Amino acid sequence: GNAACVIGCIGSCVISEGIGSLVGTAFXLG
Numbered sequence: 809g810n811a812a813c814v815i816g817c818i819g820s821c822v823i824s825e826g827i828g829s830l831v832g833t834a835f836x837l838g
Contacts (some may be wrong), residue, residue, distance in 0.1 A: 809814055 813836020820836065821829035 809833070813837060 813833065817829070817833035817836050821832035824832055824835060827831055
């Protein structure tokens with residue numbers, strides 16, 4: 809997980825509308 813993914817995870821759970829933001833941090837990868 810790069811530093812860029814961390815910043816994205818901050819607003820990934822919203823655009824992804826997943827179960828939990830904690831899981832959105834994984835999207836940072838792919």
